[PDB]
Subunit: 197 residues, 4 copies
């Protein structure tokens, strides 16, 4: 029943992990946008197929997009930060079971004015990073991945992979990339939801 | 008389260290500290070398339903141990009592003593750092179930001053003593009972 | 089309890289306008074929000063903000990046004008730190820009171009810049009061 | 002239060093006025021949205390702000640096006048951490200052002097200080309320 034991070990068992070809940090194939605790959020999944703990793990993200300044300066692929908790320190994660990374689309978010329709014709790329030190090694690892606009499933949630069994927990990685539609999901941008109230 | 010499060596002797690393108190406590309700736990280094760039984190593990009806097998909720002012970083020599101020932002804000004896959640505690003279970042973990938190308790002092040095009695590390003067209500209740004035 | 593939590999090819040694800083620094704000900028790049993990930047202005109490400080270091407060001092370095310092009210350059720079006497030390992929060794690349090495009214020449399916980085344009005669010759303080 | 060259090497030469050691703290700490604020200062240096990567400092005040609840705390470790909030706790050490703690309303020394420090019995633990250049090890240097090792009305002697082309650091001046009679004898609070 306890996820973590008094000595540090975790009562978790992983099934459907696949060949050792994986056994490393992994990102969900798709990204999603949906309501969470009353706010429109951009979310994606991260998992450690390996068997060791990832020390001082922390996540980052950036929206890549070319732009022109008022000065007329052209910038190839400006890198705009996507807030995933740095300010409060919740960008730092304890990864044992797959975690869902959440980005609140607030007034400061670069996606603040994007609706489902906008995302359809959008032309940007979101780069996601996971970094940390693999247990028993002196090397800090940097796992990367990316989500194009058309790779973001609006109105979807991730299928649970953590199941509570008898005095123990099991993680089913065959559900890692799985998502499901949530019709009730608002279709307007986060900004419209802010004014709507 | 000083705890640290000008050369960096500590004037501390350890006794009753037991038989052969890092370690966490068996229990956690909740008592009044500086006029505020706090959740506390102990962390110590039974080793000889200093811990470099050591820091602590904590998380409340519990399943919940989002306001949108979404079920999360085991949501991870951060428990503030000083990250905002950098005091999550510690200088670990003799056992240290990590303090979580249970204020309006704590997920434990509205938890009374009765709510604890009946609640069902897990508090995961982490301590990371590098053992001196090594290129390895260590991660020590532990956890406290709701019934492992002693409401109205304090830890027994382990550090004592001698003629020209300090002694650390580890046989008292896990020891705690009761304080019947401790309120049985939650932090919120204690806040209202004061703001009325 | 995309810059980073799902497997984490970067869809980029570097040409004219030369024969060389790890990280590199642009020869000159520039001062120009950007989104209604006069900024101090300099380029940083990674020639090495690997990735720079947990990479982040820092800058400092060095200059002797006498304290209001008469104390003399040889080369007092004044921090130059490049994003630490929000965490954008941490970069994902692949294609050469332009580090940006907004010359605001809290900046030590908030009073310098082009004329002031041409007559100024200070040094800006720029730092880039991070870990070379698969190495437990965090490297520190350093450089410096004297007041005269700061090109007032200049912008860097683009080095990233969109090809058919991939992206190419032309390092022969790394240190190159072009003039912006429209750049204000006054200081940031004036531009702020001119409202 | 310049302290740091384009390639990252520093134009500095050290003399009167001895026997090329490691990190070091000034034997004494001082309290003096700096830019209108009463500050607690101490010196830190790198006698090693390599650069210290991602270096930063920390300080704590060790002192037993009684809580309003009557709980006895053998040695509480109250933190001394040396710049964490703005990130200026992160230093670039090539020549001896003076760490500054601004004694403000949030400082545990806010209500301490000279006379007070003469009777005090507390202890300040100072720390310096960083990675030795080219190694994979993070080092930690420690020291401390008792209330009687704090020099009120003092400032450190300069160790960095400008030569014609480079800069020399004279370590024989590391621990030395000189008097500043002008120094207020009242606590930082007194100076604050005296306005």
């Amino acid at each position: 029943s306890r996820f973590v034991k008094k000595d540090g070990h975790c009562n978790v068992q992983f099934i459907n992990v696949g060949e050792k070809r994986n056994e490393t940090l992994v990102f969900s194939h798709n990204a999603v946008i949906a309501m969470r605790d009353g706010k429109l959020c951009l979310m994606w999944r991260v998992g450690n197929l390996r068997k060791s703990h990832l020390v001082e793990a922390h996540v980052r993200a950036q929206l890549l997009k070319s732009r022109i300044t008022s000065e007329g300066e052209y910038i190839p692929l400006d890198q705009i930060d996507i807030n995933v908790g740095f300010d409060s320190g919740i960008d730092r994660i304890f990864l044992v079971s797959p975690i869902t990374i959440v980005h609140e689309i607030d007034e400061d978010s670069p996606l603040y004015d994007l609706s489902k329709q906008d995302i359809d014709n959008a032309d940007f790329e979101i780069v996601v990073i996971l970094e940390g030190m693999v247990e028993a090694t002196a090397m800090t690892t940097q796992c990367r991945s990316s989500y194009l606009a058309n790779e973001i499933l609006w109105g979807h949630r991730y299928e649970p992979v953590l199941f509570e069994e008898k005095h123990y927990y099991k993680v089913d990685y065959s559900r890692f990339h799985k998502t499901y539609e949530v019709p009730n999901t608002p279709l307007c941008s986060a900004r419209d939801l802010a004014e709507k109230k």
